[PDB]
Amino acid sequence: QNAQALNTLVKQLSSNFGAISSVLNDILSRLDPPEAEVQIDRLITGRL
């Protein structure tokens, strides 16, 4: 059960949660802050 809980938690990092990408660095390397922040907030809400 504990292994499953951790594996689930890690797999969630691959989710977009409405963002253009699950990868945080790919958002930052592509968008200027005024737009990057929106995509990041979507990931923060999902990951939090």
């Binding site: 951790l6 938690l9 890690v10 990092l13």
Partner: protein, 72 residues
């Protein structure tokens, strides 16, 4: 406990241990009591049970012949 092992566990305990089996900010902390320390506690409880019955629970470990302990 088996004195020939790197960790003084009993034959049965070894059987039990042989049956039960990242970079994302997820880490695992060690337990305070290592398997060796747990083995020492079960050894003490077992040695107490065998040589002094229940007296070690209440107070001092009072030796009693095992057959008499069973009589009680």
């Amino acid at each position: 406990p088996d004195p020939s092992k790197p960790s003084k566990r009993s034959f049965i305990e070894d059987l039990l241990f042989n049956k039960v089996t990242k970079f994302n900010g997820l880490t695992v902390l060690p337990p305070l009591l290592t398997d060796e320390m747990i083995a020492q506690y079960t050894s003490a409880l077992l040695a107490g049970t065998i040589t002094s019955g229940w007296t070690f629970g209440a107070g001092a470990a009072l030796q009693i012949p095992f057959a008499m302990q069973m009589a009680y």
